């Protein structure tokens, strides 16, 4: 390296073997990503199939009990376990695998291996971009899913009472987590979540608009009715009319893109910024620092029996979510609340 | 063609030299959308409290009546009205029209006509520019979603009070009540729509990364690397040859997206078809087709109910159900 | 390398960037003023 | 009445970045 003799060691041979074109690229990052990701997906598929949740949550979340794909899940450990890492060799399981499954240790297994798999995957993105000599904008974009995963599956339960309040790996489990954030945190009212929603919706809009515009400015490039075969990667000309696209969107929307650089950087920028803002919001929620209330509105409605808004309706709905969900949601709290103290409307 | 009134009107309307193309779809898009914009802004600023639930209990929704941008909303039409087409001339006074929710009907009808004519105008400009016409077909998905949440869902439920409020907190209220009564999260069309927006963000990030990364040097650490040549040359920059190789080496180098046209077609079709699916899911739940109902599906050998994540969702849904419209129900079973 | 600084550069902001910055500032104010006033 | 803290915060968050961007745009357009 740098015009030097550089007598070869084991590292040169290992690097030469790892950095080779194959059916699947391995690289140095494959020493972490491949085992961690394989173990995460295998543990999730195993927990959704055989591992029960009857001990920790008091519910059935596996295929061996009668749950669907949208229903079975790898459930979090019990709240009394706290933020225990829940190793097999740890003081909880004590080297017993069939009770480690019953204690919710598979959730910690899948979560830690998924985090290290995400680390290894974005390292793999770095390594492949360095091998092909391209800028790692894919890794920069993938930094936002990693941030969302870290803030949601790690930072929020570490801020809360324990891993029990983390999202269980599933579908109905994630729906429970979402409704819990609605009822207990007022997560829709959070401006960071609003920014994240705007980012995702704008990114989907950008994807649809860019695809439709390119497919509708495709030039002739052939004689057949199928334009897909009119494309040639060898030619050095652009496959679509940027001038026509710019004039169309300038006369339709008022504004249009004039630079492909700026267009694709915006397509990169919008979802990453949205997901990072949502990650910051979930970090704020990790310590129950929630944008739950509007003080002026609540004082106005406290001194006025007439003043009602949709926000007051949402607050009333959140109260019902909390009251009617806590008793069967948190078995550690032992909330044996009678039905009369639970709030009701009229006749329902 | 030049000395005739309807002629000069026709080649002014269809002219492509306008800053914003009007067209024959624009002659309907512009007045309806301008009317909706004016009425929406005026109602959002100074709308008096309106009785949404038909129970003589008005809600404010307007800034001058004491709320902010987040909680301000043009509130839907009265439940007492139903979907009975209440315009200003069907009221005895403007105060009565405002108390019964006429601004919502006006804005929603004009907005529906305006977005339909906006889609038609997109087609018209594509036709007059020698383009291909399916940008309007791509735009048909947000129009379908807006129609489903502003027109179709009130048609199915029988009252424009079921329409989505023109606001933010009202949108959240519509969301929560819709969850409570249709279980949208457990609706497969809604799962398709969620997967569509998530994959749309995913594919937008991937496309932006692959096109922003695959470059040859034309912009330096300064504003531009024009030292090779300034503006005025057709020697193109960019790359899609190394970008496809990077994307292939990323997973297994057989899911070939080497065709840029096929890649952009996929980028166009995936969120569009998924938003079509979720808009039709809303339209089906308008007629109470609802989501998956797996409450007490898991029972043991003795028949005891084993709890389930779906059961926890059911508890949250019924907690939402008992809060919605605390005073608007007189009978136990919620059918209207 | 001499009396003037060789690393002297100027900042460039076109009208599209000015519009984007003003829009971002005003939209952020619109979103967050409801919470600042509370 | 009047939330003067919120007024000052909103006014400063509007004035300072808008003036900064306007000054940058003016000095950019002055020297092409």
């Amino acid at each position: 390296i740098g015009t030097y003799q550089e007598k070869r060691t084991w590292f040169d041979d290992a690097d030469d073997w790892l950095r080779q074109d194959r059916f699947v690229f391995v690289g140095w990052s494959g020493l972490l990503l491949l085992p961690c990701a394989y173990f995460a997906v295998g543990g999730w598929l195993t927990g959704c199939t055989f591992v029960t949740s009857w001990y920790t949550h008091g519910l059935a979340s596996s295929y061996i009990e009668g749950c669907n794909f949208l229903t079975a899940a790898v459930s979090t450990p019990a709240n009394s376990l706290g933020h225990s890492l829940l190793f097999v060799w740890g003081p909880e399981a004590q080297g017993d695998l069939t009770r480690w499954f019953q204690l919710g240790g598979l959730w910690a297994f899948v979560a830690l291996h998924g985090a290290f798999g995400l680390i290894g995957f974005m390292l793999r993105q770095f390594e492949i971009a360095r091998s092909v000599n391209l800028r790692p904008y894919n890794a920069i974009a993938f930094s936002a899913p990693i941030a969302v995963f870290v803030s949601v599956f790690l930072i929020y339960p570490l801020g809360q009472s324990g891993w029990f309040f983390a999202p269980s790996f599933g579908v109905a489990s994630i729906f429970r987590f979402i409704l819990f954030f609605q009822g207990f945190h007022n997560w829709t009212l959070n401006p960071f979540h609003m920014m994240g929603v705007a980012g995702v919706l704008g990114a989907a809009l950008l994807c649809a608009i860019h695809g439709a515009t390119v497919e509708n400015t495709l030039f002739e490039d052939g004689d057949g009715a199928n334009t897909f075969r009119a494309f040639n990667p060898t030619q050095a000309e652009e496959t679509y009319s940027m001038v026509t696209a710019n004039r169309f969107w300038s006369q339709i929307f008022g504004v249009a893109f004039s630079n492909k650089r700026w267009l694709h950087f915006f397509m990169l920028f919008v979802p990453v910024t949205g997901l990072w803002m949502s990650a910051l919001g979930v970090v704020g929620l990790a310590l129950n620092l929630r944008a739950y209330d509007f003080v002026s509105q609540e004082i106005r409605a406290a001194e006025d029996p007439e003043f009602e808004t949709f926000y007051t309706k949402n607050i009333l709905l959140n109260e019902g979510i909390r009251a009617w969900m806590a008793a069967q949601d948190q078995p550690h709290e032992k909330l044996t609340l009678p039905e009369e103290v639970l709030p009701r409307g009229n006749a329902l | 063609e030049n000395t005739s009134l309807w002629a000069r009107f026709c080649e002014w309307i269809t002219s492509t030299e306008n800053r914003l193309y009007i067209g024959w779809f624009g002659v309907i898009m512009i007045p309806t959308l301008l009317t909706a914009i004016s009425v929406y802004i005026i109602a959002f600023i100074a709308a008096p409290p309106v009785d949404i639930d038909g129970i003589r209990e008005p809600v404010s929704g307007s800034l001058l009546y004491g709320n902010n941008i987040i909680t301000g909303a043009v509130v839907p039409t009265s439940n007492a009205i139903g979907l009975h087409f209440y315009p200003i001339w069907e009221a005895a006074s403007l105060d009565e029209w405002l108390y019964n929710g006429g601004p919502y009907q006006l804005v929603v009808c004009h907005f529906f006509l305006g977005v339909c004519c906006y889609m038609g105008r997109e087609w018209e400009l594509s036709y007059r520019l020698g383009m291909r016409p399916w940008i309007a077909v791509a735009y048909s998905a947000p129009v379908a979603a807006a129609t489903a949440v502003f027109i179709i869902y009130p048609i199915g439920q029988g009252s424009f009070s079921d329409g989505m409020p023109l606001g933010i907190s009202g949108t959240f209220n519509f969301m929560i009540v819709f969850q409570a009564e249709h279980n949208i999260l457990m609706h497969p069309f809604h799962m398709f729509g969620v997967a569509g927006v998530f994959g749309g963000s995913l594919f937008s990030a991937m496309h932006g990364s692959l096109v922003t990364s695959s470059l040859i040097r034309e912009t330096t650490e300064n504003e531009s690397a024009n030292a090779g040549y300034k503006f005025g040359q057709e020697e193109e920059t960019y790359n899609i040859v190394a970008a496809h190789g990077y994307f292939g080496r990323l997973i297994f180098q057989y899911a070939s997206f080497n065709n840029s046209r096929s890649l952009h077609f996929f980028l166009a079709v995936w969120p569009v078809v998924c938003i079509w699916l979720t808009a039709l899911g809303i339209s089906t739940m308008a007629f109470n087709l609802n989501g998956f109902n797996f409450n007490q599906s898991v029972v043991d050998s003795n028949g005891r109910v084993l709890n389930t994540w779906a059961d926890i969702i059911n508890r949250a849904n019924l907690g939402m159900e008992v809060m919605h419209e605390r005073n608007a129900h007189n009978f136990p079973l919620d059918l209207a | 390398m001499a009396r003037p600084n060789p690393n002297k550069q100027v900042v460039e902001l076109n009208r599209s960037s000015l519009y984007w910055g003003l829009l971002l500032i005003f939209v952020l104010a619109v979103l967050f003023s409801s919470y600042i006033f509370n | 009445e009047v939330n003067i803290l919120g007024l000052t915060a909103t006014a400063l968050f509007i004035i300072i970045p808008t003036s900064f961007l306007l000054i940058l745009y003016v000095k950019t357009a002055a020297s092409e």
Binding site: N246 | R19 | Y19, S33 | -
Partner: peptide, 30 residues
Amino acid sequence: MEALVYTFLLIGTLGIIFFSIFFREPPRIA
């Protein structure tokens, strides 16, 4: 004031998007 600030911010955003639509820089290079 409360509603005045919201109205001012909304009309400022609308004026910004109006200026972006009509008084934009003319597009160059494609």
